[PDB]
């Protein structure tokens, strides 16, 4: 699991479930490959998106869904989606954890990048 | 001032000078129509990105070059760059602060919003 | 204005008014003296707390009562407060300023420290 | 395991390992009864500072010592410490996972709650 995405909600404390997302790859020509996507579990956990072989260098984005994840609770947010745009395995394969944390008027993004 | 984007910098504890940002606004055509750009002064704020008059409801991106700063610093960086997407005007004129919080591995964005 | 607390609302994106917080200053004998106190503004700040004549180097502790302001919005929060903790002036003379960004289950505090 | 705390630094994108903490938690008498403590692991996890049948209602203080992570890097950070208080266990017993995210000038700390 090079790639695991985390989604926490600062309202309720709790994980942000059910929470959409795609990703993508910066292609050669500058435009954006779609990559992976897939929603966060019970835990806010979002796995598997790649394997070591896919998940090479490059630039990444990540958009989350934040807009339906509070409209679903009833509430319009300030932000659209939070998006996350990195490059990965520079220097070297590395294994990403990015973690989203979520009120309607404000996130936080961060990531833990480990070596195997 | 209905627009102003301040800039900090969490590893130093001081306002983010000199930070290049980008902004658009999202056309009746889904596309990204160039709104305005600035970089942040002495005191890490960007003032004077629009009017009153200008700034009318619609969806804005602002794209902060987060990764020249860092760069410029002796870091290099996780994020590409720090976007913030979001509706605005919608009930309708308001004033908004975008405060962006730096780290070389994280950042948090958020709005205030204020009715003249 | 040596030492300036601000604090914003994270869930609403607006300024934190009438957050009462107790400043206190290490004494010699390890004891937290009682330094100033005050309720934050309709701008969400708290100005005046002390001067320069009287903030001298010490370590000094911030004590926001976040839990009466989420309590008296309808919302029961994590924390019982949120306290901020730092050495100051020790290299020497600086101004602060004190940010708390609130959730109702998270809090962030970031200090901007400048030299005049 | 009802109570964990997980230590991240926003600055190298990794766990914060070997960051020292204490547990308290208030007695009838208002004073603070040494709860638990223990050091985060390689994982910025640290686990098993109690157990189901002692954690029970009341208000825990949790001191993290942040100042001597970052020393033991070289840096003056500007925070003595970490300090989260929070009342548990008020409406049954739940699982708390304390979150810090961890920047010279600037920390988060969030808890994310769950009913097992
Ligand atoms: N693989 C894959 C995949 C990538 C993106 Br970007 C998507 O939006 C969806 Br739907 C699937
Ligand atoms: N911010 C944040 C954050 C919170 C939790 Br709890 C995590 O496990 C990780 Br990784 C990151
Ligand atoms: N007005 C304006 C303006 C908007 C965008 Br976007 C830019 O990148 C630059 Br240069 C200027
Ligand atoms: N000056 C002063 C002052 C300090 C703290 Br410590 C207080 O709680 C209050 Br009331 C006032
Ligand atoms: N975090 C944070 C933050 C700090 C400052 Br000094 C601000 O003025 C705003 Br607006 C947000
Ligand atoms: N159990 C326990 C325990 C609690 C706190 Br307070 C401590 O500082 C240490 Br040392 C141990």
Do not use: Q
């Amino acid at each position: 699991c090079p790639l695991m995405v985390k989604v926490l909600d600062a309202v309720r404390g709790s994980p942000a479930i059910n929470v959409a997302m795609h990703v993508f790859r910066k292609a050669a020509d500058d435009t954006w490959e779609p990559f992976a996507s897939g929603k966060t579990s019970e835990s806010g956990e979002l796995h598997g998106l790649t394997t070591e072989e896919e998940f090479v260098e490059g630039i990444y984005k990540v958009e989350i869904d934040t807009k339906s994840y509070w409209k679903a609770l009833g509430i319009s947010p300030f932000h659209e989606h939070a998006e996350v745009v990195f490059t990965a395995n520079d220097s070297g394969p590395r294994r990403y954890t990015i973690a989203a944390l979520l009120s309607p008027y404000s996130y936080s993004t961060t990531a833990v990048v480990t070596n195997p």
